[PDB]
Amino acid sequence: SAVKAARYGKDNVRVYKVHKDEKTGVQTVYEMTVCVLLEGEIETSYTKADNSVIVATDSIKNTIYITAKQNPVTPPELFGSILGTHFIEKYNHIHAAHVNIVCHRWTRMDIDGKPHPHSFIRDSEEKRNVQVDVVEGKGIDIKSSLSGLTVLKSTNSQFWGFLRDEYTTLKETWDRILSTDVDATWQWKNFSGLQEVRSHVPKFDATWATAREVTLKTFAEDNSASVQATMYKMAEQILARQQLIETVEYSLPNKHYFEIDLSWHKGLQNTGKNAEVFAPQSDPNGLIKCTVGRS
Amino acid sequence: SAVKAARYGKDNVRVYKVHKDEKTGVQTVYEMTVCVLLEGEIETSYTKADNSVIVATDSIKNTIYITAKQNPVTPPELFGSILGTHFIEKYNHIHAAHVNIVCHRWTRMDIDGKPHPHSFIRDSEEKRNVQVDVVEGKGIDIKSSLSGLTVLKSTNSQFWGFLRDEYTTLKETWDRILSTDVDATWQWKNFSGLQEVRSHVPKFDATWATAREVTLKTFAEDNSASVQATMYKMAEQILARQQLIETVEYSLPNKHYFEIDLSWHKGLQNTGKNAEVFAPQSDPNGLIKCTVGRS
Amino acid sequence: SAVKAARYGKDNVRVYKVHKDEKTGVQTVYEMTVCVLLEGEIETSYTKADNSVIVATDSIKNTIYITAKQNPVTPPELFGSILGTHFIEKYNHIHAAHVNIVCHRWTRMDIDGKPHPHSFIRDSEEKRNVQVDVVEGKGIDIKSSLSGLTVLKSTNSQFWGFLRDEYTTLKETWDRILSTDVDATWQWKNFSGLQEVRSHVPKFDATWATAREVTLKTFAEDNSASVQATMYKMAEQILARQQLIETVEYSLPNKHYFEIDLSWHKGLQNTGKNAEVFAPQSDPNGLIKCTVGRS
Amino acid sequence: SAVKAARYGKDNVRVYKVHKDEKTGVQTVYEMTVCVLLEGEIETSYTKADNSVIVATDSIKNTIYITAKQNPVTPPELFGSILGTHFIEKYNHIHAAHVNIVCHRWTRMDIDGKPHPHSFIRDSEEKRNVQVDVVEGKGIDIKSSLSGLTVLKSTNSQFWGFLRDEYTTLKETWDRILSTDVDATWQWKNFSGLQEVRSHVPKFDATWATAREVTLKTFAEDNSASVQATMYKMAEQILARQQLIETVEYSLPNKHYFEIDLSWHKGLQNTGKNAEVFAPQSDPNGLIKCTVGRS
């Protein structure tokens, strides 16, 4: 027996940072959850009880706090690249740093039409995330994403024409609820290192906003032939809007809302064109995935 | 041994209802989770195996769907009163109906500055709830609430002057983060029955909006001496704004964000006036409650 | 406006305690989550910003750790009474202490037929809880409970004879799955104070074990006419077995497992006597409650 | 733009199956949650709105129920291989089926020392899982696992000798609590198809039991130099015990339990050799991973 792969570090490190403008008196808060895992020459810590190779997970935690102290935490793609670069430069035997970041919403409150200088509201469980792999010799791989974006449309969604055989009971439809929690990931072209990540900084926030925007507009406007067909159009657009992205990936649950037949009761009419009252279903759910790259 | 109290029914009934305007083409969706429990002359179902007294929980579920079909589901205080009244009028041996409703956010999407006719976004995990107790002979008791309203302010919160003794380690402060998940309940004056609940319908949505509004403004503007002092001012205002409310109750966790001392590292300065980076704490948390009524 | 009720304290305080026998070398661990809320003369902290009346929630937390250090943490009814008594004796203006405790399972591991001296396994998410209200002048009220005890029987459960009307679609049955998560609470006769709670210590662990035992045996052996009928027999027995209990309360979800009709497929036979494959339902669920006291 | 990868199917399909012995009168229940995703020639459903290529997720759900009806559901490695093989044989354009299965514990109850014929208890949230990839032309890849196995030892764990630098604050120790939730995956040698999976059936249950056994014994007996060192010995043993396994992978959180210093209070002694009372920490946690293969 031998160690084929190994990684270790600190998960679930919650970090909050405040920015205080002295001019405006305006405060901006950033909250995130950070995971850093390291790889490198650390087999002996497993095979020989040699702790001498271990940057302790506690230190990794200390380091996240220190790096957040000395650097901007925004955009997360940058903070993650700084944090991961720190570890492979600092430690000779550490050859890869994987950093994962979840950003939590703290939206400035509007009190009486005006932006409050220092109060915020978690206006959704939507997250913005990054996965940053900083690998000695191979640059910086970044996947950014939004997740937990939950939407529904009450009509303009259809599903007909699908395979029918002796396993099929589903009826074709031309009018249905479509509801999903959107998970969208866009993978950046590999960057050569931190200087190159710094050089693209403005693209991160912007591409995020664009992926959100496009996601929301296509979902609302597409008269959807299927989840498959709708997510492809989203991914197609993000790719067209940002040349530094190599692939867009979507993962979409189909959260079913079933018609409830009420005709057994006083011939009550609640199906088809008469459907007003539905039973949202907790499970099962369709799960539909697509990776879209450049042709 | 004897039955001192008994109640039974259906919990976690998820209900979605769409309203379709033919004029505008505009759709409005309502999603909620409903719980109905009944009391009455049902001891024998427990003591004697006499199922003859049981309106089956499955039927209760059917009834929720039927009532949502025939009536408005909005405001929840009304839907709950209709649903609970239905059971005590329908069944001679059923003397109390308790209805609980959680309303889930489906906010109309804005696509390109304009309200989309049929697409929605779950723009927060904030809930609006009601508890409705419909009791034969005693009218209708209604408690409405908002919960899951998560907010933070980065400054303008203080906590000093508290008792100090040999259990105390906490340092007084004049500048701190205050963060909480707001739970606010307002209890209506007892209503004589459905006609009276119908007669106050416009007050429900409005008092809800007012409780949200006041909650948000006081949190943002109060320079808070304590959570205790801040929630009292909220409750005081809701009571002043709506005469049909007998009591306002608040339940506020204090979600602590700890300073991280970084001076052990290169004399890094991250405490007091220098605090930029904090560790949000998952637990423990202060829990602070207040019921405010009329003097 | 005035303060009608107020309570404040520390929730979600996780506590672990190890007992080390020097004789045997045997270790015993206890893990729990503790909530303490205080009431008393604390209105001014709300109405006047007077923090002088506040035992800080941070201190309450310190105190839980100190009391766990100086006293046994087992049985929880005792630890809770000590902790709550501490607060009303220590502080003149504090007149009620409410202590809630959740005990988490750490079951000694069996390695090769033998009890391991210092390794444990969380062998279930079942909890043992107490609620202790220590009120100046009124003694100590204790409710103990078990919760999260999830069970299923594949047969010997029935449900027929229930009310049928134009809301009913449910078919009577003589053979069904019954599954539930058991919540059982037994309320002790009021105790005059700590000395009296100390005097009954051996009854706490024993009555707990008896409530678990009885719950499990009745569920397995009763050929159940209904959840209602089954839980009453459980409660009836606990009351008979322990004279110091005034009431037993049960709260039982009915977690439905639906037959799946497969006859549309090659006339596959999966209903009634042929039912092998079922669809466990996440929601809705029947919820059934009973409080049983002495006749 | 083009589709680089695509998969779609049904997630969260809950399935229960009862086995009824007529001889013994003994019932055995199996509950699981199943996910099936398909790949193949389905790009057009995304790019062209061509639903003609879609085996509807609803049908996939129907099929899971049908296959559970006609086949054993145990061991999960077999059921998963049957289910995935079904899809690639049934449908010409479907070239890969991925099946994921979570098995939930339903442990036969012991009533009065004897195994009850038809009552069960969810005696832990521990899961047994499989991931089965059935790929046209490439056989059947199976990864089996156990997860959610939560354990603690109060002593016989150490952590000293680790790297120290200006990011380090952690103190070396020779006595600590070690607690983790075990995730252990063993990957089988690729099988040529269903006949070959059928031919190894008895190895599945047995290797599972062995991985559980070894996990528990090593955790309890190893005087652990580090999580790293402890998990390697587990993985080393599983590999030695079962020749059909190519790799064992472990993923172990380190759930920290912090000493609480109580000497500020009446010089109370609760650290080092005196530590009795600890604060279990919800987050952050060390996360430690290892893949072990054959040298």
Ligand SMILES: O=c1[nH]c(=O)c2nn[nH]c2[nH]1
């Ligand atoms: O077992 C451990 N391994 C580690 O890598 C580590 N880092 N801090 N504590 C630790 N404990």
Ligand SMILES: O=c1[nH]c(=O)c2nn[nH]c2[nH]1
């Ligand atoms: O045991 C039951 N009690 C009930 O009240 C009920 N209603 N539907 N199924 C039921 N089962």
Ligand SMILES: O=c1[nH]c(=O)c2nn[nH]c2[nH]1
């Ligand atoms: O607002 C607060 N109220 C309290 O009672 C308290 N106790 N510690 N910190 C606190 N903050």
Ligand SMILES: O=c1[nH]c(=O)c2nn[nH]c2[nH]1
């Ligand atoms: O959009 C959909 N795609 C699918 O593949 C499917 N299967 N059932 N319903 C469905 N809806």
